[PDB]
Amino acid sequence: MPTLLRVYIDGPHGMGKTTTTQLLVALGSRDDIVYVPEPMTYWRVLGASETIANIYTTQHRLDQGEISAGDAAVVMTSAQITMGMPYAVTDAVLAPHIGGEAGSPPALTLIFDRHPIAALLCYPAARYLMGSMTPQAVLAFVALIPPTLPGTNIVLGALPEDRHIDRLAKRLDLAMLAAIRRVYGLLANTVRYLQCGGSWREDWGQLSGPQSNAGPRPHIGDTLFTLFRAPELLAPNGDLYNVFAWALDVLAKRLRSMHVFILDYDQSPAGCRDALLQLTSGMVQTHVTTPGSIPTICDLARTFAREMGE
Amino acid sequence: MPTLLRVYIDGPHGMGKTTTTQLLRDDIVYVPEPMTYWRVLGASETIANIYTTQHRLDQGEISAGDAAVVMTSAQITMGMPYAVTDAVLAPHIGGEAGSPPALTLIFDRHPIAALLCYPAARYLMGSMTPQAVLAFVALIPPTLPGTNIVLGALPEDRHIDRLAKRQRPGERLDLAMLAAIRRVYGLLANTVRYLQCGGSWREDWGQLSGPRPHIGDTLFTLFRAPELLAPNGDLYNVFAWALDVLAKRLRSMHVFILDYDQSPAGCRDALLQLTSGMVQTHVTTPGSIPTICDLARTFAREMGE
Ligand SMILES: Cc1c(CC(CO)CO)[nH]c(=O)[nH]c1=O
Numbered sequence: 001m002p003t004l005l006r007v008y009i010d011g012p013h014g015m016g017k018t019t020t021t022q023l024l025v026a027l028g029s030r031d032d033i034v035y036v037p038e039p040m041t042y043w044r045v046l047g048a049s050e051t052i053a054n055i056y057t058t059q060h061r062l063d064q065g066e067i068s069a070g071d072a073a074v075v076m077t078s079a080q081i082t083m084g085m086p087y088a089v090t091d092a093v094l095a096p097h098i099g100g101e102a103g104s105p106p107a108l109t110l111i112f113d114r115h116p117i118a119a120l121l122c123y124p125a126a127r128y129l130m131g132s133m134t135p136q137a138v139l140a141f142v143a144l145i146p147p148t149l150p151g152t153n154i155v156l157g158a159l160p161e162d163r164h165i166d167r168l169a170k171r172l173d174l175a176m177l178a179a180i181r182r183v184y185g186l187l188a189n190t191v192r193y194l195q196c197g198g199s200w201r202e203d204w205g206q207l208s209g210p211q212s213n214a215g216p217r218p219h220i221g222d223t224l225f226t227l228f229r230a231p232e233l234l235a236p237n238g239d240l241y242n243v244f245a246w247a248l249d250v251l252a253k254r255l256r257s258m259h260v261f262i263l264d265y266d267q268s269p270a271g272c273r274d275a276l277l278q279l280t281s282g283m284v285q286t287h288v289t290t291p292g293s294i295p296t297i298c299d300l301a302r303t304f305a306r307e308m309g310e
Numbered sequence: 311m312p313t314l315l316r317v318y319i320d321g322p323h324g325m326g327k328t329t330t331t332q333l334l335r336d337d338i339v340y341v342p343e344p345m346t347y348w349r350v351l352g353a354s355e356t357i358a359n360i361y362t363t364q365h366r367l368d369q370g371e372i373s374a375g376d377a378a379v380v381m382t383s384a385q386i387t388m389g390m391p392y393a394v395t396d397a398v399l400a401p402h403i404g405g406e407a408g409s410p411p412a413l414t415l416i417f418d419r420h421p422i423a424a425l426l427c428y429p430a431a432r433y434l435m436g437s438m439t440p441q442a443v444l445a446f447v448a449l450i451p452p453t454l455p456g457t458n459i460v461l462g463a464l465p466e467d468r469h470i471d472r473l474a475k476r477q478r479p480g481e482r483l484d485l486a487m488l489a490a491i492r493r494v495y496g497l498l499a500n501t502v503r504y505l506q507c508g509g510s511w512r513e514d515w516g517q518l519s520g521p522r523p524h525i526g527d528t529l530f531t532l533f534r535a536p537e538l539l540a541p542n543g544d545l546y547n548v549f550a551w552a553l554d555v556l557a558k559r560l561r562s563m564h565v566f567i568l569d570y571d572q573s574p575a576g577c578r579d580a581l582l583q584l585t586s587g588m589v590q591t592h593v594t595t596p597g598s599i600p601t602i603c604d605l606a607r608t609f610a611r612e613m614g615e
């Protein structure tokens with residue numbers, strides 16, 4: 001069987017992900033690489049009306065005290081369903097075609113503009129930090145994350161906050177940028193922690209008060225688990241209710257088999273592109289399940305690109 | 311390796327599901343309704359919020375768009391317990407055993423009640439958008455082997471009668487909702503049959519606008535909704551793909567119909583007699599039963615009051 005290489009470009013917005021991705025797609029032959037872009041059209045029209053604008057409006061409303069936390073949460077929870085739809089449905093139809101891992105050329109390369117966890121974990125978690133979402137709803141999105149498919153290569157990105165703020169500026173919510181930057185830092189640390197043998201249940205008690213595929217085992221306090229210590233999730237004895245505890249187990253199982261890589265976005269567009277290109281070399285590939293999986297997968301991505309990317 | 315029997319007792323609420331299961335020490339565990347999660351843990355009185363919002367939309371106090379936001383949000387809370395239970399239980403499920411079992415796990419509902427059925431019903435009540443319904447459908451966990459689902463049968467007047475004397479905290483006796491929820495479950499049962507008999511929604515799609523149920527008698531009719539179609543009437547691919555997931559998830563489910571129009575002793579035996587044709591599965595580890603028990607008893611203890 002032919003092999004496949006799936007690469008999910010994710011991380012906080014405004015670092016140059018899209019540009020970088022397209023520069024990488026432009027290098028390869030017409031059909032040996034395909035790009036599944038940001039489904040902006042689904043977010044602005046198909047799934048609902050201007051989903052991004054509504055989110056930023058709601059937070060602003062909440063900040064000025066024009067609405068309550070409860071109102072904010074209801075809107076954000078509903079908007080993240082809508083924000084993650086396209087990633088979720090894409091994962092579900094792609095799944096059956098994915099076979100086991102081959103090893104670090106590929107008959108097909110799929111570059112995605114983000115992964116499901118972006119909408120089912122990171123943004124929600126970041127909204128929790130902004131007070132616009134409850135920790136319970138975040139764990140609800142976490143329990144709904146699709147089984148992590150083999151060969152899940154995810155590229156997170158590092159960019160100094162001052163450069164980030166600059167690049168991002170053309171609203172401008174700096175509190176949110178800080179929160180999304182923190183959430184993605186926590187995330188990469190969570191993957192290394194879990195890959196190093198870390199057991200949240202065993203280290204839980206170390207709670208009080210970034211490298212993904214390199215370095216020593218991070219402290220649970222530097223992982224995503226610490227966000228989930230909120231009083232809402234704590235039983236009268238101080239311990240996590242089992243429902244939320246089990247959601248934390250799902251979060252571990254989903255991230256542990258992922259392959260995360262860090263891309264230095266503090267360089268030029270072509271610099272980023274080559275940088276991303278070099279990184280693909282150590283990324284795990286998988287076999288497809290049927291002979292007709294490659295063509296089918298291309299159609300799916302092109303169709304997705306045409307209907308939802310612009 | 312030992313065998314396991316999973317039985318999900320679902321269907322529209324208010325027919326007797328709770329009584330049936332109740333009447334029933336180590337070869338069978340009953341995972342009950344996670345009422346405490348809906349009233350306290352997940353959020354504050356979630357059934358109340360749901361029914362209040364429908365009512366206010368009905369009275370003209372709020373907008374369809376307002377109801378939907380609350381309604382979609384509330385459905386995240388309602389299904390959480392089911393979704394989390396499926397996710398930690400999934401790993402331990404092996405292949406089908408064949409045609410007793412070491413452990414019988416009786417559940418009060420399946421993830422599809424919160425991810426498909428209630429949301430579809432709210433869509434039919436105007437309190438949820440069809441896109442939100444398909445997003446929930448995109449998140450339906452994969453259908454493992456041995457997914458036996460018991461659905462209830464009961465004449466509408468009996469149902470209203472039985473529902474009226476068994477209201478839930480914050481619930482309102484809404485007859486329009488009762489019809490909606492009853493329509494969806496009937497379509498649900500027809501959909502599984504359709505799919506198992508070879509039905510292809512893409513092939514039969516044209517029959518909505520001009521030995522298995524007609525497509526118009528399946529859950530696929532609900533998605534003819536204008537919000538999901540392009541200017542030329544074609545379904546957007548995002549949605550079509552969501553319908554492909556629905557077909558895949560439903561098709562492998564084993565549906566069993568339990569007649570509720572009888573005494574609670576009748577309904578208890580009824581369910582038990584239904585298990586002869588339910589599909590069993592192997593667990594994946596030797597210590598999978600014990601773990602499964604803890605999960606189930608703990609769930610019950612913490613979320614079933
Ligand atoms: C994926 C995602 C985003 C990313 C957007 C910028 O908001 C585009 O990168 N933004 C959100 O507000 N929620 C989400 O789920």
Ligand SMILES: Cc1c(CC(CO)CO)[nH]c(=O)[nH]c1=O
Nearest residue numbers: 323360385388389423424428478
């Ligand atoms: C499962 C479920 C229900 C059923 C309730 C009573 O309405 C408990 O059986 N009700 C909803 O409104 N959403 C749901 O997901």
